[PDB]
Amino acid sequence: SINPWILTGFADAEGSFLLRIRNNNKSSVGYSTELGFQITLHNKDKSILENIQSTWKVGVIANSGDNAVSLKVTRFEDLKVIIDHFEKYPLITQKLGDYKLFKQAFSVMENKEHLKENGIKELVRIKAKLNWGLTDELKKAFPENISKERSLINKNIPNFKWLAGFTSGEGNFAVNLIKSKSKLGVQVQLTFRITQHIKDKNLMNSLITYLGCGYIYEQNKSEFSWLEFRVTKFSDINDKIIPVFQENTLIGVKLEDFEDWCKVAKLIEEKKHLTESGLDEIKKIKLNMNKGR
DNA sequence: GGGTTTCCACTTATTCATGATTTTAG
DNA sequence: CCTAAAATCATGAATAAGTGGAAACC
Ligand SMILES: [Ca+2]
Ligand SMILES: [Ca+2]
Ligand SMILES: [Ca+2]
Ligand SMILES: [Ca+2]
Ligand SMILES: [Ca+2]
Ligand SMILES: [Ca+2]
Ligand SMILES: [Ca+2]
Ligand SMILES: [Ca+2]
Numbered sequence: 001s002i003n004p005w006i007l008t009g010f011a012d013a014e015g016s017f018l019l020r021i022r023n024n025n026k027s028s029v030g031y032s033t034e035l036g037f038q039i040t041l042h043n044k045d046k047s048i049l050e051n052i053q054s055t056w057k058v059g060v061i062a063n064s065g066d067n068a069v070s071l072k073v074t075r076f077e078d079l080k081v082i083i084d085h086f087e088k089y090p091l092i093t094q095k096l097g098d099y100k101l102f103k104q105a106f107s108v109m110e111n112k113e114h115l116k117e118n119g120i121k122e123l124v125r126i127k128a129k130l131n132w133g134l135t136d137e138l139k140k141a142f143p144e145n146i147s148k149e150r151s152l153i154n155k156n157i158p159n160f161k162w163l164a165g166f167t168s169g170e171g172n173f174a175v176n177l178i179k180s181k182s183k184l185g186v187q188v189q190l191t192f193r194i195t196q197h198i199k200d201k202n203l204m205n206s207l208i209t210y211l212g213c214g215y216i217y218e219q220n221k222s223e224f225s226w227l228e229f230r231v232t233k234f235s236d237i238n239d240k241i242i243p244v245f246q247e248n249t250l251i252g253v254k255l256e257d258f259e260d261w262c263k264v265a266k267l268i269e270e271k272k273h274l275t276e277s278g279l280d281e282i283k284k285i286k287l288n289m290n291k292g293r
Numbered sequence: 294g295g296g297t298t299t300c301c302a303c304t305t306a307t308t309c310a311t312g313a314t315t316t317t318a319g
Numbered sequence: 320c321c322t323a324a325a326a327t328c329a330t331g332a333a334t335a336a337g338t339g340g341a342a343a344c345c
Contacts (some may be wrong), residue, residue, distance in 0.1 A: 001339095065333095182320095
């Protein structure tokens, strides 16, 4: 049964809130609604979704395309369990803003106001601020006054369990083999990396101070920008990053990556990475990790 | 019921994870 | 020389979010 703060950190990484406002000829107001929370993962991490479903006793699990599986929670009574969790263990990325809109929509629907014109109008004003906002259709049907503005979230990491859940979503453990003018000709470097859209720069920057190490890099692709928190200094990896996740367990197959990674850190601690046999073992491990991803 | 809810198959854009080479520090 | 640390450059798909259709009641 997943620790609740690990669960929240994982939801910050992998969850999404949904609000559907659909044309419906059989609905009294011309529209039907659906509200919910979902996580979509690669099929290999299905057991996480089964563990969440069992931990919360809500949601349905289905294939999502050919390589992924989703846990989707939209049964209205199930949504109270979502609210109860995130009231006690609140999200800390910009997704908390989407949670706040989700709660506002939930309140409209709890009052059955979504079955009247004005409740539909209120849900449209809510949806305009949520995720990608109103569709063209909805913007057509509701050209009224609809601001897309909402407040920025600016929160710090609450604890290391949140961090373990978030890293189980967004983190990467890698062995970097660097062509080198070394005696062996290859430098072994361990890297820990977490990637996130630039909208959560404050949270990412706080990783530096929270963990006591690492750097932030920015990267572009056309208009699309993201940040990466990175650690490669071995003493920081060995004395700060590895202990954190030894005491705050990762979930999903990334746990296996972390375990292999630690095997290499052990070799480096003993200076075995400077030996031909140590280097060859490290190569085997890296091949095992990289193979499966 | 029949208006509403909930589920299930499936799609899409892009934010992730991932992979590598080059350079600098010491 | 030698090794560690940091910087730069890259890319495909798991995500992050969403859509079409309809069974299933209450
Ligand atoms: Ca994410
Ligand atoms: Ca159920
Ligand atoms: Ca992930
Ligand atoms: Ca993710
Ligand atoms: Ca691979
Ligand atoms: Ca599109
Ligand atoms: Ca890698
Ligand atoms: Ca996902």
